[PDB]
């Protein structure tokens, strides 16, 4: 069938963030970058980004776990924690 | 070679043989075997339909007695007439196609022996339903297709919503 790898998840998230226009800079997006701090993403903007992530990997993030992810590495480890994605 | 007897008895084998011999055969053989039996049934049905359009003289198959109490005499009687042959055309054609389709569609599923036995079970009891010559045989088929529907809709047993 089809199986994703940690690096595939990372590459997809990085391209995703690169596509976002509200970001500060594209070159500054790291695996451990903070969207709130480094990318300067607003309160609602990080929500838009989590929604984009779930629309991209086909999963459903609860409210309590959505607001917990603050870094890109946090996003990647969450998306790799989920079996069907 | 008796068309009516084969039309009844071959889906019965495609139903029961997987339940008797599934652990010994495996789903590869079971899928191919059930599909082949249903195909042969469908072919026999098409030939019978051709002849019946030639000569509308239905075959009857009259077997042992069910009840012979005071005035009520019920027998395991079957006939294939125009109405029945139209039903059987639909039933056997769609059943053979669904059997072939399921080889591919269910290839990953762990429980394929049970699934194919149940599809064949449904075909057999529906054939019984339409070929019976009295309302009792009709009812026998009527209740058994309900049982089979229960077993099929709940095929994925661990799923609450399916149950």
């Amino acid at each position: 069938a089809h199986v994703l790898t940690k690096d595939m998840i990372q590459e997809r998230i990085v391209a995703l963030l690169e596509s976002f226009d509200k970001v500060n800079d594209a070159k500054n997006i790291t695996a451990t970058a903070n969207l709130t701090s480094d990318l300067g993403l607003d309160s609602l903007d990080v929500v838009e980004v989590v929604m984009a992530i779930e629309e991209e990997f086909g999963l459903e993030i609860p409210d309590h776990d959505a607001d917990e992810i603050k870094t890109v590495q946090q996003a990647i480890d969450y998306v790799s924690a989920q079996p069907a994605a | 070679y008796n068309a009516i007897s084969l039309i009844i008895i071959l889906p019965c084998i495609s139903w029961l043989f997987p339940l008797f011999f599934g652990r010994q055969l495996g789903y590869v053989f079971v899928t191919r075997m059930t599909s082949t039996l249903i195909i042969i049934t469908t072919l026999i049905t098409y030939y019978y339909f051709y002849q019946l359009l030639g000569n509308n003289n239905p075959i009857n198959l009259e077997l042992f007695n069910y009840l012979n109490i005071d005035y009520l005499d019920i027998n395991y009687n079957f006939e294939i007439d125009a109405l029945t042959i139209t039903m059987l055309l639909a039933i056997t054609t769609i059943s053979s196609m669904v059997h072939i389709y399921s080889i591919g569609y269910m290839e990953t599923d762990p429980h394929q022996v049970r699934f194919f036995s149940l599809l064949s079970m449904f075909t057999f009891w529906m054939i019984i339903l339409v070929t019976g010559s009295n309302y009792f045989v009709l009812f026998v088929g009527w209740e058994f297709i309900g049982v089979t529907s229960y077993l099929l809709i709940s095929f994925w047993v661990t799923r609450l919503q399916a149950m």
Partner: protein, 83 residues
């Protein structure tokens, strides 16, 4: 794909992805039994097969209806709607 399953669980249906190593030999046995059963059934049920029409003659049908009329005249039997 697949996943582990308990090997002690014995089901008549074979359980999980049942594909025995000797399945082709077992299939030969199963098909032989199937052919034997189908042919025995087809032959044994042959004497109980008959066609629907042209099995009784017009003589029998006509005379049976005549006798029933005789029976209904011995008793006092008017017809349905006959009043």
């Amino acid at each position: 794909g697949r996943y582990p399953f308990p090997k002690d669980v014995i089901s008549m249906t074979g359980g999980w992805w049942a594909n025995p190593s000797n399945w082709k030999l077992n299939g030969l046995f199963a098909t032989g039994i199937a052919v034997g059963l189908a042919l025995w059934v087809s032959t044994a049920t042959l004497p109980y097969t008959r066609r629907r029409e042209g099995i009784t003659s017009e003589s029998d049908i006509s005379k049976w209806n005549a006798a029933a009329g005789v029976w209904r005249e011995r008793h006092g039997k008017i017809s349905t709607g006959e009043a």
